[PDB]
Ligand binder design. Structure first.
Ligand SMILES: Nc1ncnc2c1ncn2[C@@H]1O[C@H](COP(=O)(O)OP(=O)(O)OP(=O)(O)O)[C@@H](O)[C@H]1O
Ligand SMILES: Nc1ncnc2c1ncn2[C@@H]1O[C@H](COP(=O)(O)OP(=O)(O)OP(=O)(O)O)[C@@H](O)[C@H]1O
Ligand SMILES: [Ca+2]
Ligand SMILES: [Ca+2]
Ligand SMILES: [Ca+2]
Ligand SMILES: [Mg+2]
Ligand SMILES: [Mg+2]
Lengths: 304, 307, 310
């Protein structure tokens, strides 16, 4: 995976600058390789020449040039996709949910988004041959809906160790936008020493609906949301995790969330426990419909 | 094709000066001729008289004077237009997408901005008889939404070889604005060895939205964007390629301000129609009337809306 | 028209001095007469005595004294104005574009400055009876947006031959500010053989935005722009042509033209363009020494700028 920031100390950078970068937020070399010189200058104890040297050393360690499309195709042919537990959804998504890209699921009030998030969180720890990724899951709730009993019930279906499953899912809650942003830095610091395969942010843009109800305060809300999405994309690129976010339709979030998201899914109520999932936006998937139901076990095919 | 910069060696310029110019970023005689004196002076190993001699020698090889409109008309009546794969869009554009100028597309999400670029990256390799440009393609990515499977599908539709079209596409990923600008210098470096016909930037204004935050950073943001667009224009002029860029839409207005509106030559406004059909409208053009067209995104790329 | 500089040889000036003047940039007696002594001294082969002798001889051939206002009124009553192709714009401008001065059009994108430039380039070749300048046109382009097909369409509208219209237009492309300034010397050199009636620069400020980037280069930018505008004024005074330039807008932190006070003070007439409905546009008088502040409406059709239909 990513190379730890300790490599720069060996490369020639003194330990004090490495500590300054670590306390700044950069942890895995590629974090400072992807950052502009302005961000490095913003650090209180780094000069322009020091920033230039650090950027050159970081660029010397990672490839940041041109390459053919054959190499990219070969690299992408081994991208890990995480299953959802439903055969129809797996067929619709052509394998499952891809890593390294942001996926957004949105719908009406209580249309089954949190159940999908729980199923993804429990299934991301499965072995690859069974459709998992062998990685710890991080769950960032902001509405207070995390129910561990659902995790126990769904893990009973696959027969995994419930205590081990609950030990492999980090949990956090945010009360305002600033804490939500700082949780991203905490996750970036935490992901260095452990293997994470799936990061979940629950229904987002909800705090921006209420905390930013003013008329002239809209621009700050939009800018903060854009920065949050950019940080999410940076994390997904850096650690190769499948960021799954959630949204709710009443619009105040705007087109920023739609542009930033790579794959979007639309969920609507059906008949009984059956619900409809429709691909809303994707660069490589056609529009289609799928039937899925949420039973007591979790998320699965609509059995009739 | 452009003349390599080595032609200045036998005109009276020693090798080390040519090496300094090549390290600066110039790789053709046209690039040296078009550059102002200030750019040449700023090089550490170049003096006043040296710059004057270099400029005179470069101007001796490149025509930079007056002509008539008949000669320009004759020259322009043979430029290459790359078809978009849709007959209606080709009729709307009166031939296809024009080389040597900048074309900008903007609109909502799922409007087909990336699908058009994916189709063009394959169509630019067709023979001129079939409507291609007979050259390679270059792709610069910002959101990381490059999918070679679309290229394979389009190549299969047009009866080409998938491996051949894959080997003819150069791909790069930009993580910030500075890398985005450095990739242009690298592209200028690598555009002399082979022949390229199309250059794609997608997106062009995505990173500027979040890289510059404070209200005191607006001027620097706009100046950086202007420099980027000027570099794109320089590449298009000196290599005769077709530059296509993509914009976001924030009854709708694209982002970027007046700089990108003035710099762009042709602007296409894309909005979703019904089903898989989309509507393209000409938003700005020096020679094209304001009209509309219908097209669809099928399983093999952008094509006519079949019903 | 102007008198060629070879006339000075009969007054007691050696041929080599005239050749030095010609290679310096002067091609008419008027250009030498208007020039200050510093410019003549700057030439390598000219001394102070030679400079003052040349200045006296040149001033002997042109009038540079006082006169009454009746004579100026009578002379100005015979000035030439070029129609814009739209009756509303001609009524607003009281005849059309005026020769001998600098006219500037500015506005955001899509407003139609380039269309007006193309229409004027075609129109300035009409006879004075029909509202033309009866001369050639010169087009200087800095953005690569020159389209001869628009010229052919506009010429077909007026029942002219397309081949002659295309033959009577000179086109140049500028790649930087230094080249943009250098093209004016060649323009002055080639304006003596034939008769020109219109000079178009489009646009005059596009390259200055990127050639000088930082705040430390603002003063040099403005001085270069001022020198370019002074050269344009000298050309307009020397050859009696109509100079039309275009400009871009910036957002006030609601749109104002770029260029600062130099281009605001230099320009004589300023036109403000903005979009109306459909293909129709609105033109407003921004600054003029003799025209009231008013508005007019025109449209961009398939055959160039014209009056809005219905
Ligand atoms: N194989 C396919 N068959 C049919 N339609 C497809 C296929 N692949 C993608 N699409 C269509 O592509 C559309 C998305 O278009 P595209 O990826 O070009 O968006 P975009 O304009 O780049 O959006 P954004 O603003 O998010 O970048 C989807 O609505 C989907 O219907
Ligand atoms: N043949 C035509 N018929 C109708 N409209 C046309 C035709 N050719 C061009 N147009 C219109 O001309 C407009 C473009 O304006 P143009 O580029 O000439 O001026 P501008 O806005 O001053 O330019 P710039 O983008 O360089 O600042 C578009 O709205 C387009 O619809
Ligand atoms: Ca999207
Ligand atoms: Ca434009
Ligand atoms: Ca004035
Ligand atoms: Mg896209
Ligand atoms: Mg224009």
């Amino acid at each position: 995976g990513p190379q730890p920031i300790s490599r720069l100390e060996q490369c020639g950078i003194n330990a004090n600058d490495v500590k300054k970068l670590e306390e700044a937020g950069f942890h895995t070399v590629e974090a400072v390789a992807y950052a502009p010189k302005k961000e490095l200058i913003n650090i209180k104890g780094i000069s322009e020449a020091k920033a230039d040297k650090i950027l050159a050393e970081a660029a010397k360690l990672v490839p940041m040039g041109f390459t053919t499309a054959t190499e990219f195709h070969q690299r992408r042919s081994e991208i890990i996709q995480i299953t959802t537990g439903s055969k129809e959804l797996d067929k619709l998504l052509q394998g499952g949910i891809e890593t390294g890209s942001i996926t957004e699921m949105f719908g009406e009030f209580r249309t089954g988004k949190t159940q999908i998030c729980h199923t993804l969180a429990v299934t991301c720890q499965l072995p690859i041959d069974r459709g998992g990724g062998e990685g710890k899951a991080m769950y960032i709730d902001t509405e207070g809906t995390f129910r561990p009993e659902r995790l126990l019930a769904v893990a009973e279906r696959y027969g995994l160790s419930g205590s081990d499953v609950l030990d492999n899912v980090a949990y956090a809650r945010a009360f305002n936008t600033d804490h939500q942003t700082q949780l991203l830095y905490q996750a970036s610091a935490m992901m260095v020493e452990s293997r994470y395969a799936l990061l979940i942010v629950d229904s987002a843009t909800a705090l921006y609906r209420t905390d930013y109800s003013g008329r002239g305060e809209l621009s700050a809300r939009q800018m903060h949301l854009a920065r949050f999405l950019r940080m999410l994309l940076r994390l997904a690129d850096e650690f190769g995790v499948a960021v799954v976010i959630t949204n709710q339709v009443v619009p105040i979030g705007g087109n920023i969330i739609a542009h930033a998201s790579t794959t979007r899914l639309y969920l609507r109520k059906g008949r009984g426990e059956t619900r409809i999932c429709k691909i809303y936006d994707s660069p490589c998937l056609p529009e289609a419909e799928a039937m899925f139901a949420i039973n007591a076990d979790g998320v699965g095919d609509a059995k009739d």
